[PDB]
PDB file of C-alpha atoms in Angstrom:
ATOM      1  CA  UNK A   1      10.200 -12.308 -18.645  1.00 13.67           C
ATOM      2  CA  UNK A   2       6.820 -11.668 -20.279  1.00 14.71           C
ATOM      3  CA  UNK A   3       5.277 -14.112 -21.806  1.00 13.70           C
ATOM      4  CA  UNK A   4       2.092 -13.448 -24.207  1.00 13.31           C
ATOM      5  CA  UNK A   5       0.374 -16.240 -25.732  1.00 13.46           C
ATOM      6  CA  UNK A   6       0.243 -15.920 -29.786  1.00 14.96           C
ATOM      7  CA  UNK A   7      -2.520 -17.798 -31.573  1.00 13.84           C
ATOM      8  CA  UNK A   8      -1.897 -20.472 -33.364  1.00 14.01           C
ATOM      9  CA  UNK A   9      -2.595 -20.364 -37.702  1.00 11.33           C
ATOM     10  CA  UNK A  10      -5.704 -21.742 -39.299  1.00 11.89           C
ATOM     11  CA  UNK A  11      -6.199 -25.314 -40.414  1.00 12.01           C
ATOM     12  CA  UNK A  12      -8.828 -26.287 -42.916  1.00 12.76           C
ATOM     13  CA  UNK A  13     -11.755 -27.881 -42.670  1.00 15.61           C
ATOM     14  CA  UNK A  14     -12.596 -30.534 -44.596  1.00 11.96           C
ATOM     15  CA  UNK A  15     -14.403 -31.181 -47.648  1.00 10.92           C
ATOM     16  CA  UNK A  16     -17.149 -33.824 -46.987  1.00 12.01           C
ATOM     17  CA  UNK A  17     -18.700 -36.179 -49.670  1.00  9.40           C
ATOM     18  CA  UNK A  18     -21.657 -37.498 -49.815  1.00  6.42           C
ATOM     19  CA  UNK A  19     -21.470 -40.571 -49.025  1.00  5.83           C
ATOM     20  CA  UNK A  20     -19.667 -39.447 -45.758  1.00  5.49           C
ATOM     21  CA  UNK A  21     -23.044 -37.619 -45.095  1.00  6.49           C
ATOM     22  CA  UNK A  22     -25.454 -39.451 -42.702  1.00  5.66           C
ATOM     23  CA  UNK A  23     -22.445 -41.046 -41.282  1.00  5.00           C
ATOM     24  CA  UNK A  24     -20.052 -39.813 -38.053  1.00  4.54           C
ATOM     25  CA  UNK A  25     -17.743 -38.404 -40.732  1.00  5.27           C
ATOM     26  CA  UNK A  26     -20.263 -36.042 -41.802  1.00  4.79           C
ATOM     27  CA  UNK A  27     -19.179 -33.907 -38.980  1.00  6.11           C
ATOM     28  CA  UNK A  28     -15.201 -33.632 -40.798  1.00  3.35           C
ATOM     29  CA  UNK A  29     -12.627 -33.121 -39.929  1.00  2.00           C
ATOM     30  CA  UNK A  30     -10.962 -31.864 -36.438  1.00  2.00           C
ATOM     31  CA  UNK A  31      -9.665 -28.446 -36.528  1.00  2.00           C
ATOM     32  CA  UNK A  32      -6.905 -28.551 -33.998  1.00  2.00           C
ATOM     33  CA  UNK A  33      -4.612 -25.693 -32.322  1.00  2.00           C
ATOM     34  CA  UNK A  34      -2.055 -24.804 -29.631  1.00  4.58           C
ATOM     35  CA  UNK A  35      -1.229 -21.293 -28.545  1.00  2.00           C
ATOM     36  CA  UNK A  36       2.034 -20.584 -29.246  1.00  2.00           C
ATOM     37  CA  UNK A  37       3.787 -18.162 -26.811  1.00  2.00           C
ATOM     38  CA  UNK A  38       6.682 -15.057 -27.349  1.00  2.00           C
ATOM     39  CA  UNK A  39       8.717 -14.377 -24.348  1.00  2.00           C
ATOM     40  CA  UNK A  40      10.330 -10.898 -23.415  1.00  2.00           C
ATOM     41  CA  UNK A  41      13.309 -10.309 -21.171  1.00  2.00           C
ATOM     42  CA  UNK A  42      15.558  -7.289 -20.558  1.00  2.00           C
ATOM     43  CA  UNK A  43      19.335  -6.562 -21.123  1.00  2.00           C
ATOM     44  CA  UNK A  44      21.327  -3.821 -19.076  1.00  2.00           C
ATOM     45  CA  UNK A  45      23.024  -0.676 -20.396  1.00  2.00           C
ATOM     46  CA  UNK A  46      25.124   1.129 -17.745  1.00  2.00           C
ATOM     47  CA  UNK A  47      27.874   3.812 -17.537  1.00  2.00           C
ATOM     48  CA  UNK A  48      29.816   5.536 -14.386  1.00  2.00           C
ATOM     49  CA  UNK A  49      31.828   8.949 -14.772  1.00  2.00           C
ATOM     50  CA  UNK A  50      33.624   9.995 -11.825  1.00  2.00           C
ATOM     51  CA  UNK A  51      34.331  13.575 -10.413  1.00  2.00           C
ATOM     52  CA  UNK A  52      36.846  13.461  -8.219  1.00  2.00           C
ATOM     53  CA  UNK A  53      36.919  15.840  -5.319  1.00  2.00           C
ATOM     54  CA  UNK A  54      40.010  17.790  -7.399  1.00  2.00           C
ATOM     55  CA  UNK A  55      38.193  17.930 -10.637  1.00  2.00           C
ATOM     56  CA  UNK A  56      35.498  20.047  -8.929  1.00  2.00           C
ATOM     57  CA  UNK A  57      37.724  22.559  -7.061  1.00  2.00           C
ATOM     58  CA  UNK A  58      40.494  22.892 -10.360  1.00  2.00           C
ATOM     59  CA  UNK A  59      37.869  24.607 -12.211  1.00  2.00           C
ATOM     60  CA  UNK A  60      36.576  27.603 -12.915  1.00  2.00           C
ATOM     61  CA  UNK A  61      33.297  26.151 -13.932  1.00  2.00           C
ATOM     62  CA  UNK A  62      31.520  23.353 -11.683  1.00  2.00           C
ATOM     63  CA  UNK A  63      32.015  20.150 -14.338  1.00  2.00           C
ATOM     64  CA  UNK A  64      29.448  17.737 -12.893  1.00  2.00           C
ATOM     65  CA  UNK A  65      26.588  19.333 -14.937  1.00  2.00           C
ATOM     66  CA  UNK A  66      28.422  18.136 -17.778  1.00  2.00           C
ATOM     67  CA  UNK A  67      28.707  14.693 -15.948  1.00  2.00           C
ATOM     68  CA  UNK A  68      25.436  14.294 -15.407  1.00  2.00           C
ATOM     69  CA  UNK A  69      24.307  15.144 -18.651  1.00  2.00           C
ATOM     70  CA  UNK A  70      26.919  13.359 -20.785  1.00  2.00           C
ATOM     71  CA  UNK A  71      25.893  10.868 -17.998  1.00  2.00           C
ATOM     72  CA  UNK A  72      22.426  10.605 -19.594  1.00  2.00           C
ATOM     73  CA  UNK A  73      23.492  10.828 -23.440  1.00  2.00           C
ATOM     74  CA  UNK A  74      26.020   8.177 -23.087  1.00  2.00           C
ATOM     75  CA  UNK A  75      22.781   6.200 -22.380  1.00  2.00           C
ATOM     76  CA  UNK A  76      20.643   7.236 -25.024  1.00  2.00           C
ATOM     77  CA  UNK A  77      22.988   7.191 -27.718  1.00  2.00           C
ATOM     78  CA  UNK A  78      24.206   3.613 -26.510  1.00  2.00           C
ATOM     79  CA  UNK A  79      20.729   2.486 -26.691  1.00  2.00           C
ATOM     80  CA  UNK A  80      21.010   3.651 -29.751  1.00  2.00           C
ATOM     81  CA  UNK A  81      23.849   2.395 -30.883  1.00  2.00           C
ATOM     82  CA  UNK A  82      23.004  -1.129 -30.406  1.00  2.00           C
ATOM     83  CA  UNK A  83      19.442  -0.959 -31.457  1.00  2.00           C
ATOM     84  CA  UNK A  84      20.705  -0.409 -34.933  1.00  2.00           C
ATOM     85  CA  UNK A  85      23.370  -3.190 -35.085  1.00  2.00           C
ATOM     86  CA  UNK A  86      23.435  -4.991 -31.616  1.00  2.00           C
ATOM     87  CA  UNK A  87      24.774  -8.432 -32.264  1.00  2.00           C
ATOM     88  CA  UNK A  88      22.602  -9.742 -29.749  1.00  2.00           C
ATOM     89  CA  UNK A  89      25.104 -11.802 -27.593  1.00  2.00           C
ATOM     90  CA  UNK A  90      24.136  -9.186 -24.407  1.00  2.00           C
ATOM     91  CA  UNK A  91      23.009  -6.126 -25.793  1.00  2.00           C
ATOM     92  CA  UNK A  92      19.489  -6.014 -27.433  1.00  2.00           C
ATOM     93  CA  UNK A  93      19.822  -7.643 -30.778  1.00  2.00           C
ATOM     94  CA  UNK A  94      18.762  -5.142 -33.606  1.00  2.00           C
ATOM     95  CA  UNK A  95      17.082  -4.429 -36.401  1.00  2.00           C
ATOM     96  CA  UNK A  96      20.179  -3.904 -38.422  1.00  2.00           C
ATOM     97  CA  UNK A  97      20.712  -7.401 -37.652  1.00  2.00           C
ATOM     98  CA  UNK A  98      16.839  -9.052 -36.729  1.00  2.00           C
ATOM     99  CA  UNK A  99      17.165  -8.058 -40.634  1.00  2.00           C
ATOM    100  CA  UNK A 100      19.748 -10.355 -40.815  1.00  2.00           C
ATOM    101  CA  UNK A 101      18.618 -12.821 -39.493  1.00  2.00           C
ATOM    102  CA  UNK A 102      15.341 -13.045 -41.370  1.00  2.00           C
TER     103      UNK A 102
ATOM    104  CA  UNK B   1      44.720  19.762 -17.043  1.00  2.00           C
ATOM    105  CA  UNK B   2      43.647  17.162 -14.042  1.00  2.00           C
ATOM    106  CA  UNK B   3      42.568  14.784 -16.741  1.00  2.00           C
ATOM    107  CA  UNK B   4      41.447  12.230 -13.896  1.00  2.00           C
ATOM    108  CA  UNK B   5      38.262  13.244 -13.772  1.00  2.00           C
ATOM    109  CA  UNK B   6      35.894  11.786 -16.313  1.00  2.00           C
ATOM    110  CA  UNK B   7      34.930  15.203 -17.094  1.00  2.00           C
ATOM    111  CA  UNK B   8      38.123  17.301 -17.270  1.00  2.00           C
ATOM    112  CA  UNK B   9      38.575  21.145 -18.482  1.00  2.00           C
ATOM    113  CA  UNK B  10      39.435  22.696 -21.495  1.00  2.00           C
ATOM    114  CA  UNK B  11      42.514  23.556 -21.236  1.00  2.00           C
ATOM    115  CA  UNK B  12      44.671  24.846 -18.293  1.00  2.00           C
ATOM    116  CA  UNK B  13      43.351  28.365 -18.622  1.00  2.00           C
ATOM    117  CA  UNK B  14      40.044  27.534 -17.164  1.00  2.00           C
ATOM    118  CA  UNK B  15      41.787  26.036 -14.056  1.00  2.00           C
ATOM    119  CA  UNK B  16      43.288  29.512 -12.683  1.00  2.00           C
ATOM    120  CA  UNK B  17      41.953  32.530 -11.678  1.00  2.00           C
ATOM    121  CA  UNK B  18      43.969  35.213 -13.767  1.00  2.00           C
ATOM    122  CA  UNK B  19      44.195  37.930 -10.838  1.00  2.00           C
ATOM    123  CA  UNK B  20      45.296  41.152 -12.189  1.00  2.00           C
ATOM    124  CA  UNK B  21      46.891  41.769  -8.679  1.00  2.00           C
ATOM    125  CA  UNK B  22      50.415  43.746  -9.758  1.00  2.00           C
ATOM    126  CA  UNK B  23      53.330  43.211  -7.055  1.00  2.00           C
ATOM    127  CA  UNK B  24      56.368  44.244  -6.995  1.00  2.00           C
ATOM    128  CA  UNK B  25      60.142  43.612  -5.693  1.00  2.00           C
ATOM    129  CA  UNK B  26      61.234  45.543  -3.139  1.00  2.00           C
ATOM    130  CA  UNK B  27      63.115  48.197  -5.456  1.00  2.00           C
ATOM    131  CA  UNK B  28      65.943  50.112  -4.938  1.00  2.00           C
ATOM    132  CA  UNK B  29      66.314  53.011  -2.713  1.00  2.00           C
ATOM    133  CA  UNK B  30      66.669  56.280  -4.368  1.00  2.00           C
ATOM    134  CA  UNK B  31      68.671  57.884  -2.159  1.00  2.00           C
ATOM    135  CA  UNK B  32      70.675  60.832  -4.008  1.00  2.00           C
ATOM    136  CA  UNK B  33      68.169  62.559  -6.220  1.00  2.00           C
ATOM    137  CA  UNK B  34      66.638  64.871  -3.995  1.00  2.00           C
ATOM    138  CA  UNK B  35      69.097  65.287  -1.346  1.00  2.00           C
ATOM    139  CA  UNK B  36      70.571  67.974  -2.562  1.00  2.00           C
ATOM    140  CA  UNK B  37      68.531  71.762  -2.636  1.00  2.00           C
ATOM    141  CA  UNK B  38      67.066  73.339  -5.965  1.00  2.00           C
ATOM    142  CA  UNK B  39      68.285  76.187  -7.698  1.00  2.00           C
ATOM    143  CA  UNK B  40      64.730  77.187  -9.456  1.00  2.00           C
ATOM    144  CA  UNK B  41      67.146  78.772 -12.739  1.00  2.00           C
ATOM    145  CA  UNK B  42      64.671  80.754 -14.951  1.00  2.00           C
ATOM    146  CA  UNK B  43      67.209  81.661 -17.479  1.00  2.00           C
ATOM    147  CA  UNK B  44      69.636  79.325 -19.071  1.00  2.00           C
TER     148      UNK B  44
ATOM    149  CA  UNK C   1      41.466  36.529 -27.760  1.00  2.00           C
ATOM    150  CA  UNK C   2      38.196  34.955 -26.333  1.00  2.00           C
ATOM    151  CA  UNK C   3      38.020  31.444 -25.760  1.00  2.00           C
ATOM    152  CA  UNK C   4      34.630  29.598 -25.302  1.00  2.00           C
ATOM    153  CA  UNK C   5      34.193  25.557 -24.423  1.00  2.00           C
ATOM    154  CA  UNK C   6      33.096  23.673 -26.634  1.00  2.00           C
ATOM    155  CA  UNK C   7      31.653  20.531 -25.414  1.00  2.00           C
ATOM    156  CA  UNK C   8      32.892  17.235 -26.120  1.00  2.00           C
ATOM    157  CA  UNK C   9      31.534  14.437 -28.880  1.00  2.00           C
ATOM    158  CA  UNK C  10      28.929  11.802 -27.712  1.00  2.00           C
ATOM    159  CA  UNK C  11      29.921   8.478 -25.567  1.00  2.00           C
ATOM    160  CA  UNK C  12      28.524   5.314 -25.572  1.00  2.00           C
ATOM    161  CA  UNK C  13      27.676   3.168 -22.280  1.00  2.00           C
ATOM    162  CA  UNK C  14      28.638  -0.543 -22.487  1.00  2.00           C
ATOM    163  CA  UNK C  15      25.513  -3.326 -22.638  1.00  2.00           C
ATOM    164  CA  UNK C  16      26.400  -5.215 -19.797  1.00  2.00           C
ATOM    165  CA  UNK C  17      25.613  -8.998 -19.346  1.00  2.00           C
ATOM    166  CA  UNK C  18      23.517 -10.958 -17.059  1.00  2.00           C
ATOM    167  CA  UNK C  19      26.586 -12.852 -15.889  1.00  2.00           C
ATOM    168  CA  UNK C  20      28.165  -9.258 -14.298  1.00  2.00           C
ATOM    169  CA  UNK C  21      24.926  -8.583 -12.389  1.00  2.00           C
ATOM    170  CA  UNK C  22      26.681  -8.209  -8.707  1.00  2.00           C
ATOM    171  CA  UNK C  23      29.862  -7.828 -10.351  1.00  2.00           C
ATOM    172  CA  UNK C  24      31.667  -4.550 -10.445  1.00  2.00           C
ATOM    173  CA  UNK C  25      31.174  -4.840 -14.562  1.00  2.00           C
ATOM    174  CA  UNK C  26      27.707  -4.699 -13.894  1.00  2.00           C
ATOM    175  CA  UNK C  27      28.181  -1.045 -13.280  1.00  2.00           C
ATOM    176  CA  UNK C  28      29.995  -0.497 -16.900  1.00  2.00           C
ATOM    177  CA  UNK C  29      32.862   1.712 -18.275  1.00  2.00           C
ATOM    178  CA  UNK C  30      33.688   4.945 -17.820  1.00  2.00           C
ATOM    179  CA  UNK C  31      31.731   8.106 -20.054  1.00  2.00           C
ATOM    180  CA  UNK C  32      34.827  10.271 -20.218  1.00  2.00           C
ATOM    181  CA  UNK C  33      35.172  13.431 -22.066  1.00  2.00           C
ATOM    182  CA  UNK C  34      36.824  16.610 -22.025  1.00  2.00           C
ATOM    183  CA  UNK C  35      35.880  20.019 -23.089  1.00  2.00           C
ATOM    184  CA  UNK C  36      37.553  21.755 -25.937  1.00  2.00           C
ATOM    185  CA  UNK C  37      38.296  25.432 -26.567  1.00  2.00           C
ATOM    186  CA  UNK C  38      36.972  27.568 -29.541  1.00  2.00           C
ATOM    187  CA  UNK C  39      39.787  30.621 -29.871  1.00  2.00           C
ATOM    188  CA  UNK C  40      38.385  33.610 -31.115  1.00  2.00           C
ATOM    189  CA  UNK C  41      40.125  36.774 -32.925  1.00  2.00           C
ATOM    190  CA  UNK C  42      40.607  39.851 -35.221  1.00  2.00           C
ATOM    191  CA  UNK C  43      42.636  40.968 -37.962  1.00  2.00           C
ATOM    192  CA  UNK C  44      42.977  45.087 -38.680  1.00  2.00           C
ATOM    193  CA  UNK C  45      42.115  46.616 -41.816  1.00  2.00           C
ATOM    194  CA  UNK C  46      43.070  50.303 -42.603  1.00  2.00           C
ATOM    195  CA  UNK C  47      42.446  53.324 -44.783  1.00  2.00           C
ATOM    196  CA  UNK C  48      44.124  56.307 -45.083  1.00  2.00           C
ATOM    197  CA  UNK C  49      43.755  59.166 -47.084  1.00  2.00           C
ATOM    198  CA  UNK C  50      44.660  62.680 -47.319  1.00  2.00           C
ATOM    199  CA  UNK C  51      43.424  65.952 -48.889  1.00  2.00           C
TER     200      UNK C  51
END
């Protein structure tokens, strides 16, 4: 996790009188806050392909380049997926559906 | 097409090697056409 | 005829949970895909004429 600390909103300060003036109230009001904090954790996106020892010698061409690559799309595109509508349960929630929410 | 791969070829053509290698049976023998001698006619 | 691969559509990897960390579902499921084939050819067109 990461946790930052947000500050807290503004609160007024008061509108003395005048009688209140020579007196402890003079001073007003307290203006009082606590930090607030946002938290960040991570979620996991994985995939597996598997050349077999067959695949590789019943082609003509070598086939894991493809793996490899269609290895790393599969990632990107599931990011990508998600990040648009990712309900959230355990994929990152998105902004298709942070909309939502809000 | 050895589709248990995860990243299988197109289609079974790109899984052999098409040799142009051209064999033949054993054939029959020929053996009566040139037995016999030549008459080398010039006229019909 | 001249056939050419063309390489398959886009696959997605699976968001896996914190409860399948040191699971084998931690790993995911499988990207598969399979190449296609593009067939190429030609079609004669002729002429003829005579003087």
């Amino acid at each position: 996790i990461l946790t930052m600390l947000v500050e807290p909103d503004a609160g007024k300060a008061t509108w003395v009188a005048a009688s209140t003036y020579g007196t402890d109230t003079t001073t007003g009001e307290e203006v009082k806050g606590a930090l607030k904090e946002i938290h960040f954790s991570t979620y996991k996106l994985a995939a597996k392909s598997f050349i077999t020892d067959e695949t590789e010698e019943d082609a003509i061409f070598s086939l894991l380049p493809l793996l490899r690559k269609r290895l790393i799309e599969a990632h990107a595109v599931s990011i990508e997926e998600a990040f648009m509508t990712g309900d959230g349960s355990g994929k990152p929630k998105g902004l298709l559906t942070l909309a939502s929410e809000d | 097409v050895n589709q248990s791969s995860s990243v299988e070829v197109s289609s079974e053509s790109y899984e052999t090697i098409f040799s142009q290698r051209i064999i033949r049976d054993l054939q029959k023998e020929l053996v009566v056409g040139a037995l016999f001698e030549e008459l080398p006619m010039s006229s019909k």
